[PDB]
Amino acid sequence: VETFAFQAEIAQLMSLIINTFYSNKEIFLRELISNSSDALDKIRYESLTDPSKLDSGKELHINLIPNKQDRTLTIVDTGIGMTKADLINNLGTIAKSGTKAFMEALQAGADISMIGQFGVGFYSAYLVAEKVTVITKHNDDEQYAWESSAGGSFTVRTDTGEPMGRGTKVILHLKEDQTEYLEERRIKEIVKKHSQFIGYPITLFVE
Numbered sequence: 001v002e003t004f005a006f007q008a009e010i011a012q013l014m015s016l017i018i019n020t021f022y023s024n025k026e027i028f029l030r031e032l033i034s035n036s037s038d039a040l041d042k043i044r045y046e047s048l049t050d051p052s053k054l055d056s057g058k059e060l061h062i063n064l065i066p067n068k069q070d071r072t073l074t075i076v077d078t079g080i081g082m083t084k085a086d087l088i089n090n091l092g093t094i095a096k097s098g099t100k101a102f103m104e105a106l107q108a109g110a111d112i113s114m115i116g117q118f119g120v121g122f123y124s125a126y127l128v129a130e131k132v133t134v135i136t137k138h139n140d141d142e143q144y145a146w147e148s149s150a151g152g153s154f155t156v157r158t159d160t161g162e163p164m165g166r167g168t169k170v171i172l173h174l175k176e177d178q179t180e181y182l183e184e185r186r187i188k189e190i191v192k193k194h195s196q197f198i199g200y201p202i203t204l205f206v207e
């Protein structure tokens, strides 16, 4: 298990997300689904020139999995996945410019729901989750588990668990007062409202 520090701007963005009073928390789901959709667009496009890129899985879909016992809501996709370099450096590096712009916009009237317009919507997961675990597998790399309870640090380890073939699972360990996002009717309401026109089948699992 390796422990890394988030870059200062990213740590600041996560603190803001965690500390700002903002009741419209549901937007986190639209943001994660949109991220899944972009990851699925990526593998689908690369597979046009290299069909073997789908040898790790032909299905392209998004599954939403609530688990009341564990208090988690998991967003699963069979998209392109993330390499170790993406997890420890590249994604955070790219999010720096969007972070600065977003934070500037916030001081100038914008609100949290616009986070996705700045390409840093993944961090909105912290509106609802006290901890986020990400299991991911990219064709060119091993399966990894990234995890963070914010606080300026995250971990990365090679994952020994059930192999996923290819894709990403975002496991949201929900805050005590955010369990409504485990309810079937609440999830459906949010997906219908914000994610109506996504081009991959989204399956809402039940318990």
Ligand SMILES: Cc1nnc(Cl)c2ccccc12
Residues within 6 Å of the ligand: 035, 087, 091, 092, 095, 122, 134, 146, 168, 170
């Ligand atoms: C920026 C970003 N987007 N999506 C996912 Cl699943 C991430 C996981 C770890 C770190 C950054 C992420």
